[PDB]
Amino acid sequence: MRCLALDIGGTKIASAIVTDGKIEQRQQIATPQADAANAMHDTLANILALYAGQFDYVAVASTGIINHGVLTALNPKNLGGLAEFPLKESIARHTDKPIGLLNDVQAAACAEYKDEDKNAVQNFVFITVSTGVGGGIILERRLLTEPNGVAGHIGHTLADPNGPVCGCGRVGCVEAVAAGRAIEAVSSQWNPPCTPKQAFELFRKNDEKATALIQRSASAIANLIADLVIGLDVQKVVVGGSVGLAEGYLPLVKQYLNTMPHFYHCTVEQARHGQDAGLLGAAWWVADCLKQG
Amino acid sequence: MRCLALDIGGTKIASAIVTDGKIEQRQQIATPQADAANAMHDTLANILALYAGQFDYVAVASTGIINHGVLTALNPKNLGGLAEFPLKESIARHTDKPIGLLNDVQAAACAEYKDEDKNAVQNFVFITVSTGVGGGIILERRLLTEPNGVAGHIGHTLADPNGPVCGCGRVGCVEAVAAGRAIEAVSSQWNPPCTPKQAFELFRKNDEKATALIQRSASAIANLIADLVIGLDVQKVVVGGSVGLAEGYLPLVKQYLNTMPHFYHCTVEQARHGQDAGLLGAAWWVADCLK
Ligand SMILES: [Zn+2]
Numbered sequence: 001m002r003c004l005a006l007d008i009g010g011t012k013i014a015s016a017i018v019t020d021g022k023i024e025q026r027q028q029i030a031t032p033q034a035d036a037a038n039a040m041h042d043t044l045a046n047i048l049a050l051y052a053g054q055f056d057y058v059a060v061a062s063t064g065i066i067n068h069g070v071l072t073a074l075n076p077k078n079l080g081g082l083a084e085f086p087l088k089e090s091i092a093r094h095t096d097k098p099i100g101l102l103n104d105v106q107a108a109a110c111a112e113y114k115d116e117d118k119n120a121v122q123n124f125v126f127i128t129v130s131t132g133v134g135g136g137i138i139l140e141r142r143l144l145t146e147p148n149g150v151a152g153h154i155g156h157t158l159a160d161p162n163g164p165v166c167g168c169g170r171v172g173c174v175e176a177v178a179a180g181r182a183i184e185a186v187s188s189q190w191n192p193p194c195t196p197k198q199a200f201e202l203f204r205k206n207d208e209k210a211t212a213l214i215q216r217s218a219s220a221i222a223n224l225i226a227d228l229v230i231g232l233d234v235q236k237v238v239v240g241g242s243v244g245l246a247e248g249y250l251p252l253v254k255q256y257l258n259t260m261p262h263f264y265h266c267t268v269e270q271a272r273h274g275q276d277a278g279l280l281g282a283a284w285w286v287a288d289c290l291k292q293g
Numbered sequence: 294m295r296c297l298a299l300d301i302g303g304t305k306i307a308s309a310i311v312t313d314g315k316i317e318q319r320q321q322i323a324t325p326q327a328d329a330a331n332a333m334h335d336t337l338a339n340i341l342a343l344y345a346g347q348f349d350y351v352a353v354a355s356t357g358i359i360n361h362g363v364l365t366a367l368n369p370k371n372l373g374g375l376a377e378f379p380l381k382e383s384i385a386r387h388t389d390k391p392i393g394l395l396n397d398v399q400a401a402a403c404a405e406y407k408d409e410d411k412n413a414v415q416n417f418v419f420i421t422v423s424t425g426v427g428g429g430i431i432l433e434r435r436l437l438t439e440p441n442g443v444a445g446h447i448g449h450t451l452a453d454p455n456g457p458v459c460g461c462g463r464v465g466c467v468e469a470v471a472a473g474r475a476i477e478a479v480s481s482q483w484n485p486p487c488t489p490k491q492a493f494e495l496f497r498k499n500d501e502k503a504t505a506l507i508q509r510s511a512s513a514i515a516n517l518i519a520d521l522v523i524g525l526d527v528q529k530v531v532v533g534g535s536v537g538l539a540e541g542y543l544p545l546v547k548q549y550l551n552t553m554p555h556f557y558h559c560t561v562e563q564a565r566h567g568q569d570a571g572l573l574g575a576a577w578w579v580a581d582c583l584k
């Protein structure tokens with residue numbers, strides 16, 4: 001089975017043929033910015049032409065939210081000229097093979113899940129802690145995507161009803177307490193200012209103020225994990241992203257989780273897939289859909 | 294098909310034959326307390342005899358948690374002598390038919406979902422706000438139960454990291470700020486003491502202190518609903534229970550929810566099934582599983 005996988009990001013569009021989880025014929029180009037909507041139709045025409053006859057199906061990971069084949073977002077302006085872009089329709093102009101679309105965190109979730117023992121692990125959550133907090137949720141071995149592609153936006157679940165206002169407008173989201181943006185909102189105000197990277201370095205040197213800031217983030221992620229375990233019977237959580245993978249961070253998350261009653265505990269491990277997670281995860285998911293009907 | 298439906302509670306065991314969603318031969322007995330574990334094997338044998346040959350399958354709703362046919366709980370001591378009771382095995386002694394088990398809030402969820410237009414509503418949550426807070430979660434038209442029957446315990450998701458300690462041991466659960474037990478933990482300390490029922494009465498008379506207490510509960514339920522909408526793409530939430538159905542409560546929940554950004558919104562409405570929700574929901578779910 002030959003998959004044309006596309007990974008459409010904020011800056012780069014990666015494309016490849018994926019066969020048996022193996023990547024070939026890589027290309028990377030800039031995500032259209034000038035006349036973005038018009039330009040994207042051209043780009044997609046170009047990509048599908050370049051790979052003509054090379055694929056049995058198309059799988060597309062994209063930042064934002066996929067709502068019935070259309071690119072959208074909680075705040076649509078974060079996508080600029082691609083807000084409400086008719087992604088599946090534009091690709092279908094150029095091929096009659098099946099086309100599956102998911103968002104980039106859902107694709108990364110699938111990349112990490114494909115290597116699991118599916119008999120042992122059927123309820124699985126990927127959390128990325130980066131500039132923001134994103135998630136992808138797999139229950140009974142199947143990714144949650146219906147009906148409108150929003151499932152997995154667990155960065156926007158409540159962390160503290162007295163916490164800061166989130167970028168989305170809700171008071172106290174996980175993302176407003178735990179994300180890199182949230183760490184930098186505090187560390188940038190220090191005298192002198194520090195980046196999140198510098199805050200982590202001080203944390204590893206036992207600076208008490210920097211430690212408090214990292215603990216604020218890690219404890220919020222621990223409480224999200226506990227919610228997922230008790231609300232959904234999640235069995236395993238994998239954590240990635242620049243903050244999620246920072247040295248010392250996941251051990252702190254797991255320390256907070258383990259202080260809670262035993263029925264909130266689950267397997268928590270670091271993400272193992274890198275740049276190609278979107279291509280591989282999207283390819284795995286669409287094939288899974290097709291195999292299942 | 295003909296369903297023998299059992300609803301096993303902390304005080305009463307109800308049984309009945311359910312066919313085409315209609316109940317026949319409703320019977321109700323006391324939940325065993327003396328020598329409870331031994332006694333329950335007898336009770337179940339008695340019930341299976343009374344309805345012998347009248348059912349194609351058995352469906353059992355129970356308080357607590359169903360883990361691979363065993364009756365359990367987050368704190369199994371809350372079940373007394375029925376902790377870790379081998380429920381499915383005990384019933385299977387007396388019949389060869391299929392047996393499905395789910396917990397009582399999950400069954401209530403299915404009772405409310407059964408009447409929905411399932412083309413339009415596939416992601417559905419039932420929340421009961423009573424002495425505690427419980428839930429049942431349906432996604433893509435199917436109830437969540439795997440692997441260990443815990444899914445839906447959303448009363449133990451976080452409401453406030455600086456809130457009270459929950460009965461389960463976690464700090465700040467929805468249940469520890471929103472449930473009737475949490476309302477009473479505050480109203481019982483008033484001078485003079487008040488019950489939640491009296492707190493609600495004062496709330497409806499614009500007593501500011503009682504209003505703050507009821508608002509604390511409703512706001513926590515609203516934030517739970519928002520978490521489910523944004524985390525799971527839930528389309529409808531139905532709220533029941535003595536607190537949930539109290540006059541003026543759900544309007545207050547919907548008022549807090551509607552003040553959040555619109556992408557947290559969904560349909561929120563009162564529970565419409567009563568005492569038979571466990572029997573009817575369990576019968577519907579097991580039939581749905583049988584397909
Ligand atoms: Zn938010």
Ligand SMILES: [Zn+2]
Binds near residue numbers: 449450462466
């Ligand atoms: Zn709790």
